[PDB]
């Protein structure tokens, strides 16, 4: 669903929507990805837990950051839903860049049936800055579990008898509001000065 | 708490107790371990979700396996709480072996302040059999994030001004009923023929 004119993101509908994402991690076809899935669900659960304390006070994602800034003083933004969403957005951003890169025909012509170059760009853009050396190594090792581009798209459809070309068009359509939403979240962190750069 | 004479493990108290374990993963002192924590909590949450449907029907862990065998026929044991507990026990077992190995003075004399040999034995005994080649590599990479033995024990106390010797005695005491409980769980899977050996 698109953004309102005021670009405020409603927390309830947002959480409803993003809870559809973790299951997709089996479109990757390896148990290597199950811990990532659990990790992302954890951020969603935390934001949900905060939201459920006072859906009115926490009606928008902006409100979450505002109220928590006040509630936590010097520990903010490394606290609460503000912290879980700071990490969730980076996961969302990684997915966005990865998909877009694939949709844009970016590839290694030496190895066109893979998705390493797309995941690597996605990692560099969304996460690398916030991760130390050992996590970068674990990411680099994790990539050997990544499905073939073929299989990945196939899985985003299913046995669903549809072309690669069709699947990519649907992904392209999807990316429009997905990207716009994530850009509003990143903009909100920037303007509230809530972004932390610690390397984990 | 010890086992009853009938060795039946009550589900409610078990879940209460094991929910204390995931937080310990920060005793390891690296965000490398956060996905593992989320993974283990996921198994606990799933068992809890099943238990909450009918605490009477699911009063013991044995009951879980029994009722699910019946409910799921040919998909059992790769289903439900039986599957989450099959994986939880392996995590519990890994922790047990790791601790015991440390308590038993097992070490690499070339590198005594580390815990690699203890984690490696723990991995070989609890998990290696169920994991493919890429996960074994990720485990092997993860170990470079492992704390020094010193720091690990220190963290199991805290600033808590207590000796290594003291901490290990408390761990030894802890391991008695911990181990006995886990042995009953493994025995139950064996006798119900509910163990799956698929390599993930
Ligand atoms: C045999 C078993 C061996 C397995 C051993 C380990 C396996 C490797 C696991 C490590 C992999 C690296 C991934 C690291 C992830 C997390 O450290 C980071 C930070 O996570 C946050 O840490 C936080 C603490 O922050 S800190 O105070 O700054 O430390 C919080 O705990 C926060 O929780 S919450 O309560 O706020 O909601 C939590 O998510 N998470 C991320 O990096 C996001 C990962 C998004 C993944 C995007 C998709 C990747 C796809 C990969 C496929 C190629
Ligand atoms: C930048 C971001 C990069 C990060 C990318 C990935 C990082 C690496 C993550 C992979 C690490 C390997 C660990 C793999 C764990 C899991 O695959 C396995 C199986 O997990 C189960 O899979 C299951 C599916 O089973 S299957 O049908 O057979 O596939 C279920 O999904 C089950 O969920 S539940 O719903 O049943 O409750 C789920 O736990 N889990 C384990 O191996 C247990 C791990 C215990 C860890 C013990 C402590 C390790 C400490 C390490 C420190 C040295």
Order of helices and strands of chain A: HHHHHHHH
Broad shape of chain A: globular
User: How is the main sheet of chain A built?
Assistant: none
CATH superfamily heading of chain A = Glycolipid transfer protein
CATH class of chain A: Mainly Alpha
Helix content of chain A: 55-70%
Number of DSSP helical runs of chain A: 8
**Any idea of the CATH topology of chain A?**
Glycolipid transfer protein, GLTP
Derived structural class of chain A: mainly alpha
Number of strands of chain A: 0
Greatest interface (CB-CB under 8 A), with counts per chain: A-B, 19 and 19 residues
Q: How many domains make up the 3D coordinates of chain A?
A: 1
- The oligomeric state of the chains shown is homodimer
CATH structural architecture of chain A: Orthogonal Bundle
Question: Ligands bound here?
Answer: the ligand CCCCCCCCCCCCC/C=C/[C@@H](O)[C@H](CO[C@@H]1O[C@H](COS(=O)(=O)O)[C@H](O)[C@H](OS(=O)(=O)O)[C@H]1O)NC(=O)CCCCCCCCCCC
Distance between the termini of chain A: 33 Å
Strand content of chain A: under 5%
PDB class: lipid transport
Keywords: GLTP-fold, lipid transport
Assembly: dimeric
Entry title: Crystal structure of D48V mutant of human GLTP bound with 12:0 disulfatide
